[PDB]
């Protein structure tokens, strides 16, 4: 609906994707249809980015949540600096947080089990504040993203 651009909904999407990447999906009903569609498309992008930018990424050290947040903000700023927003770019936000959590898992100096909750938080912060208006105007997650990316 129109309310799916609120912070709580986006935070759940970002947390769902990191739990997918970390192979710790929460039990119960399971992820929403939006999250189910997103996880497949975002993971496809993540694998391709990891392959194409292996040298640059292998060169990066994500040693803390603060370094993850600063790098995330710096990368997102440049990706979106041209003012263009579309669903493909929104997908790469999730793909990049998946790259970040994987590097943190290996490189975090003081690893903590709630780390992925912090990462997904500032990811939702960026999505809502920088793309929330566009997402709403383009049908939200249910009538926009899922309609375009679900199977035909």
């Amino acid at each position: 609906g129109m309310t799916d651009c609120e912070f709580g909904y986006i935070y759940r999407l970002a947390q769902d994707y990191l739990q997918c990447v970390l192979q710790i999906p929460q039990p119960g009903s399971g992820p929403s249809k939006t999250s189910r569609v997103l996880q497949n498309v975002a993971f496809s992008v993540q694998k391709e980015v990891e392959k194409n930018l292996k040298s640059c990424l292998d060169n990066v050290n994500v040693v803390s949540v603060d370094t993850a947040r600063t790098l995330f903000n710096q990368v997102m700023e440049k990706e979106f600096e041209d003012g263009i927003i579309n669903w493909g770019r929104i997908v790469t936000i999730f793909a990049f947080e998946g790259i970040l959590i994987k590097k943190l898992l290996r490189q975090q100096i003081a690893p903590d089990v709630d780390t992925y909750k912090e990462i997904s938080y500032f990811v939702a912060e960026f999505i809502m504040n920088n793309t929330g208006e566009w997402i709403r105007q383009n049908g939200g997650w249910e009538n926009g993203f899922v309609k375009k990316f679900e199977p035909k």
Partner: peptide, 23 residues
């Protein structure tokens, strides 16, 4: 690599993903 190659590499992968469902 660096921030730049990563960010604009992400942008390129995005606009491709986007275009490939834009029918």
């Amino acid at each position: 690599x660096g921030v730049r190659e990563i960010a604009y590499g992400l942008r390129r992968a995005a606009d491709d993903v986007n275009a490939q469902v834009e029918r």
